[PDB]
Amino acid sequence: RPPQFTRAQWFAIQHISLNPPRCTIAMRAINNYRWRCKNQNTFLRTTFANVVNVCGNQSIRCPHNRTLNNCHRSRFRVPLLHCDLINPGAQNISNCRYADRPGRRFYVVACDNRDPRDSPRYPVVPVHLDTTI
Amino acid sequence: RPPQFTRAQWFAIQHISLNPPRCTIAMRAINNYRWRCKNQNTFLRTTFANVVNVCGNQSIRCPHNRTLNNCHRSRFRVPLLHCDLINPGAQNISNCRYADRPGRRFYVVACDNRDPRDSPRYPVVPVHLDTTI
Amino acid sequence: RPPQFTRAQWFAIQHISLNPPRCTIAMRAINNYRWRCKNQNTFLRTTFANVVNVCGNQSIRCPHNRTLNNCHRSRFRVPLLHCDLINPGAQNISNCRYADRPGRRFYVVACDNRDPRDSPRYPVVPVHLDTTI
Amino acid sequence: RPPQFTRAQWFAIQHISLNPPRCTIAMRAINNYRWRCKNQNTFLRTTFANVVNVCGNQSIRCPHNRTLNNCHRSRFRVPLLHCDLINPGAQNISNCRYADRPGRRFYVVACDNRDPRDSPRYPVVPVHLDTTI
């Protein structure tokens, strides 16, 4: 996570976009902050407030990150854009290209207490997109 | 406003971006929904929650839409990216180009009651960026 | 606070009454839920919505609960009924009597995020009447 | 309706009480404004905001007042207190006594555009309790 952002803000940068450009473009926003291009990434076509509400759902074991049990599954499916790296052959991150996979899925997020810099309007915030179902 | 979006969602698409790309790229997201390229546009580098807070500030006359008095001035400045159309003689919206002007200003928003499709976390939402100061 | 009520509901019961009966009658509603009769209490003659508006005013130090800084001062005065216990030597709560002091004052409230059981129309609600001015 | 109150405020005075006293006491608040004691009255043990939400439900023919079709049925039942006059024998309104009937029912309200004095937070407000079901 870039220090410029709280965990919730970085979550939103990586995973919330109401109307993302195609993945090869959308992924630049994330990969600029990285050593190497991200292998895969999902953008949920929803709002931050909608995801905060999912933090209020039943807490579950995080499917990917199974040392954690601060995960929460959405009650409903949301439209999304999945991005898959097609050229892991490195050189520079500006050269990374992605396959586009639009879809509609439930999502599972890890939620934590907010950063002091996050709005007091959300005591608990999403901090990681664990997986989609 | 495109029918796909509520007024609050369209406000966010046009005016909220924590880390926007340069204006010529950033403005495509907006201009795709327009007949002609937008002459100017400001992206506030803040969160939706922070803008909603402004809605609770003292109501004032809207500076640029003076038939309205449901405007609200922010209490603090925010970093932002202002975009200015530089080729209004553009053939197609795909070819519109913008000058970039990063800044830090107070802003004024018009706010209204939320749309049924908006998150219940905000009964009162920004619906227009009236101006910046 | 009685468990039957959210903090916002209990705030309303204690402090919001458009047309309260005289204090000796009005205070029974509160004192029924208490071990001992309340020494003083103000009923604001306003609406819940108007008090919620105050929550969006500038945050200040709570005058009477100075460990808190989630207080907010109203921008205008409201009519009110202040009640003062006149027989603290009362046998039972049924026998407590109050002096009536109608007035018109600014008020200061502490506000917090709503309870899951509160109406979604107000994500931020008054939870305590800190003082009047 | 007493001129001191908007239609929505008068609705709330007559029909919204989270914790009403027994009917003989509760009804004084209404009957003080009347020539003769009200024959019957229901207090809904809910909040104004909850009732405003019911104004968003399907519009129906008003069961009692059948010249109107701006009525709305609650989706769920609410606890309430019904009050029935037991001594229509007049003399003074201070002497009126009521039978208490606690219950839990759906309710039907007539809703209209708000008074300019009502909060802009509710464009539409309840103005009459038409019946309970």
Long-range contacts: D96-101, Cβ < 8 Å, 24+? Answer: D96/D24, D96/D27, D96/D31, D96/D37, D97/D24, D98/D22, D98/D23, D98/D24, D98/D26, D98/D27, D99/D23, D100/D22, D100/D23
DSSP state of D122: -
Helix (H) or strand (E) holding C41: strand C40-44
In the numeric block, the tokens 């003689």 are attached to B89
Give the separation between CA C104 and CA C78, rounded to whole angstroms. Answer: 5
Chains that touch C (3 or more CB pairs under 8 A): A, B, D
For residue A93, give the 3-state DSSP assignment.
helix
Number of neighbouring beta carbons within 10 Å of residue D82: 17
The DSSP bridge pattern shows strands B98-105 and B107-113 to be: unpaired
Give the separation between CA A132 and CA A125, rounded to whole angstroms. Answer: 18
CATH number of D1-133: 3.10.130.10
In the numeric block, the tokens 């290209």 are attached to A97
Strand order in the sheet with D59-60: D59-60, D71-73, D107-113, D124-132
Span between the terminal Cα atoms of chain A, in Å: 25
Token readout for A58 is 């039943």
For residue D59, give the 3-state DSSP assignment.
strand
Give the separation between CA A99 and CA C79, rounded to whole angstroms. Answer: 64
| Contact between C10 and C114 (Cβ < 8 Å) | no
Q: Between chains, do C28 and D21 touch, taking CB under 8 Å as contact?
A: yes
Residue in B with minimal Cα distance to D57: B116
Residue B122: its chain A contacts at CB < 8 A? 49
Do at least 3 CB pairs under 8 Å connect C with A? yes
In C1-133, which ranges are continuous DSSP H helix? 7-15, 23-26, 28-31, 48-55
In chain D, which ranges are continuous DSSP H helix? 7-15, 23-26, 28-31, 48-54
| Contact between B74 and B55 (Cβ < 8 Å) | no
Please calculate the CA angle A113-A117-A121 and round it to the nearest 5 degrees.
60
Closest-CA distance, D11 to chain B, in angstroms, reads 23
Output b/e per residue, A14-47; b: 16+ Cβ within 10 A.
bbbbbbbbebbebbbbbbebeeebbeebbbbbbb
**Catalytic annotation, residues of C:** 15, 128
Residue in A with minimal Cα distance to B2: A19
Give the separation between CA A125 and CA A48, rounded to whole angstroms. Answer: 9
D120 near B CB under 8 A = yes
**Catalytic annotation, residues of B:** 15, 128
C116 near D CB under 8 A = no
Count each helix (H run) and each strand (E run) in chain A, helices first: 4, 7
Closest-CA distance, C66 to chain D, in angstroms, reads 30
| Contact between D94 and D87 (Cβ < 8 Å) | no
Do at least 3 CB pairs under 8 Å connect B with D? yes
Closest by CA position to A69, among listed A115, A107, A112, A106: A112
Q: Which of C119, C122, C124, C125 to mutate to test the interface with D (most CBs of D within 10 A)?
A: C119
Residue C55: its chain D contacts at CB < 8 A? none
Residue C55: its chain B contacts at CB < 8 A? 56
Residue in D with minimal Cα distance to C21: D29
> In three state form, how does the secondary structure of B45-99 look?
CCCHHHHHHHHCCCEECCCCCCCCCCEEECCCCEEEEEEEECCCCCCCHHHCCEE
Helix (H) or strand (E) holding D131: strand D124-132
Portion 15-44 of B in contact with D at CB < 8 A: none
Q: Domain residues of chain D, as ranges? A: 1-133
- Find out whether C53 is annotated in a ligand binding site: no
- Find out whether C42 is annotated in a ligand binding site: yes
Closest CB to B120 among C57, C58, C120: C120
Q: Which of C71, C113, C122, C127 to mutate to test the interface with A (most CBs of A within 10 A)?
A: C113
Report the half-sphere exposure of C131 (CA within 13 A, side-chain side): 9
> What are the residues whose beta carbons fall under 8 Å from the beta carbon of C67, sequence distance 6 or more?
none
DSSP state of B38: -
